[PDB]
């Protein structure tokens, strides 16, 4: 029981909110709830698209949602039919009118959430974990990270004895607060239960 | 450097000291960017780690060894005293003279005798 | 503690007599940070030293303190099975501290009902070489000496 959330630890400094609206005591409750049914819906529908973030701004009580995906192709559709329904789905579940923008994650191999998702997906499909891990870290570093770490939880290869295979390269100065360590976490659901996957990508300083 | 314009005080303290010991230990050893073609050692027993390394890379070892030393691990010996400043200078100097002559451009004997004891 | 000797706290002098020794003593009279009460108790008490003698309280105060300081104390040291109370010197600092504490501790054993009287009379008695503070101090040199046999462990 230790190591605090490398995002939570940064926030004001180095790394920004995933939702930036204001609301007073009477309001926050309901907009936060929305935010959440929003993220939740997009979290499962845009799985194939490899989504890293779901940033949510909110102004004249109107809602813009930026979805930072690796595969905008997938969220869009051929000529944008899929993103049609997506804009209508959100509107169905929120009593409101919601801008849904896409944004290509330029390099998906520096997106901790994606790197993490990829390894998780690999595991879900009976891939060797140690290798999967080690490779993920090679990909991250090749893509110019100053350092990267990846951690698969336990029940690797299906064992009775749960474990925790880690693997890392470069600097990952978690105590350093100017660092800019993206962090990411996906599940592997398996016949044999869940393994969790943590990726840390270190990108630079100041 | 106009980067030194900036940089914390901690970097100044740390970087100056660092250079200083680099400067200290690597002054000679920087002029060669390649395994030498021979090493020339004064006390080869005193400097046996160095002899060991060359011996291991098939680098010739030349030395000014005296009665203390194991000549069998020296390829070209100058059997002679290796403790008198006077003795070394004699042999270090004539040895270098030989080098310059043979590289082209014979010279004067340099400062050596600073205050010979 | 382990690393170093520890700095002794310089007390701020007294606001009347300007003596650092008076604020020490006041700080011993003080209970739960109620320092006003304390210094108010010490000064009343100084006025009781007027009413019951044309002597300055400071002079008499300083004299009580000097007669309650101990010379030597048994300090517990251990062999490794049974334990010996060993006699040895007392620091200047420790002396002062012991003296003021006993003084206060002694003063509050007393049977009079106001504190200021208790502290005054106990000051008077101690400068006259015999209060309950002085017994404590005596008891402590009669604890050394009762154990002068073991003075060859002086730690």
């Amino acid at each position: 029981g230790n190591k605090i959330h490398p995002i939570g630890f940064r926030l004001g400094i180095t790394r920004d909110w995933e939702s930036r609206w204001y609301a007073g005591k009477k309001q926050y409750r309901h907009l936060l709830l929305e935010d959440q049914r929003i993220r939740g819906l997009l979290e499962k529908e845009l799985y194939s698209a490899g989504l890293a973030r779901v940033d949510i701004e909110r102004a004249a009580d109107n809602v813009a949602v930026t979805v930072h995906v690796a595969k905008p192709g997938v969220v869009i559709g051929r000529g944008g039919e899929r993103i049609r329904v997506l804009r209508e789905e959100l509107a169905k579940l929120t009593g409101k009118n919601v801008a849904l923008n896409v944004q290509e994650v330029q390099n998906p191999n520096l997106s901790a959430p994606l790197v993490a998702q990829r390894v998780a997906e690999q595991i879900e499909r009976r891939f060797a974990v140690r290798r999967a891990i080690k490779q993920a870290v090679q990909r991250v570093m090749e893509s110019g990270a100053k350092g990267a770490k990846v951690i698969v939880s336990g029940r690797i290869g299906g064992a009775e004895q749960a474990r925790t295979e880690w693997a890392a390269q470069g600097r990952v100065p978690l105590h350093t607060l100017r660092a800019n360590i993206d962090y990411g976490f996906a599940l592997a659901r398996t016949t044999y239960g869940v393994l969790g996957v943590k990726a840390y990508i270190f990108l630079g300083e100041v | 450097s106009p980067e030194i314009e900036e940089r914390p005080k901690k970097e100044q303290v740390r970087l100056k000291h660092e250079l200083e010991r680099l400067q200290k230990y690597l002054s000679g050893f920087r002029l060669l960017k390649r395994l030498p073609d021979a090493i020339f050692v004064v006390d080869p027993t005193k400097e046996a780690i160095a002899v060991r390394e060359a011996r291991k890379l098939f680098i010739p070892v030349i030395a000014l060894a005296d009665t203390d030393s194991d000549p069998d691990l020296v390829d070209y010996i100058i059997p002679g005293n290796d403790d008198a400043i006077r003795s070394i200078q004699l042999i270090l100097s004539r040895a270098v003279d030989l080098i310059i002559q043979a590289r082209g451009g014979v010279v004067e004997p340099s400062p050596s005798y600073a205050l010979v004891q | 503690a382990r690393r170093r000797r520890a700095e002794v706290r310089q007390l701020q002098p007294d606001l009347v007599y300007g003596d650092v020794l008076v604020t020490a003593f006041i700080n011993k009279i003080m209970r739960d940070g109620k320092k006003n009460l304390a210094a108010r108790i010490f000064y009343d008490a100084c006025k009781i030293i007027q009413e019951k003698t044309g002597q300055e309280p400071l002079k008499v105060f300083k004299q009580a303190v000097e007669n309650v300081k101990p010379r030597m104390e048994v300090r517990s040291r251990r062999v490794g099975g049974a334990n010996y109370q060993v006699p040895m010197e007392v620091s200047p600092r420790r002396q002062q501290s012991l003296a003021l504490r006993w003084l206060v501790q002694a003063a509050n054993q007393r049977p009079e009902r106001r504190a200021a009287v208790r502290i005054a009379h106990e000051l008077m008695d101690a400068a006259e070489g015999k209060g309950g503070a002085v017994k404590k101090k005596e008891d402590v040199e009669r604890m050394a000496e009762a154990n002068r046999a073991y003075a060859h462990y002086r730690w």
Binding site: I4, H5, I7, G8, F9, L11, G12, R15, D16, W17, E18, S19, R20, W21, Y22, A23, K25, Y28, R29, L32, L33, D35, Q36, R39 | - | -
Partner: protein, 60 residues
């Protein structure tokens, strides 16, 4: 008793008193902060992701 208890919490019944806070992701009934509509676990989990807008690790 959980799924049907997160449900019976939403319907609002005889006597105003019978209604209770109940966390909005967790069904948790205890340690739900009325500002967020969240359990104290829920609130920590989100807070760290930067999904509670404005909310920061505090330190003084």
């Amino acid at each position: 008793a959980r799924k049907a208890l997160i449900e019976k919490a939403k319907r609002t019944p005889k006597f105003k008193v019978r209604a209770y806070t109940r966390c909005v992701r967790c069904g948790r009934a205890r340690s739900v902060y009325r500002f967020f509509g969240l359990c104290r676990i829920c609130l920590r989990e989100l807070a760290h992701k930067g999904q509670l807008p404005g909310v920061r690790k505090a330190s003084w």
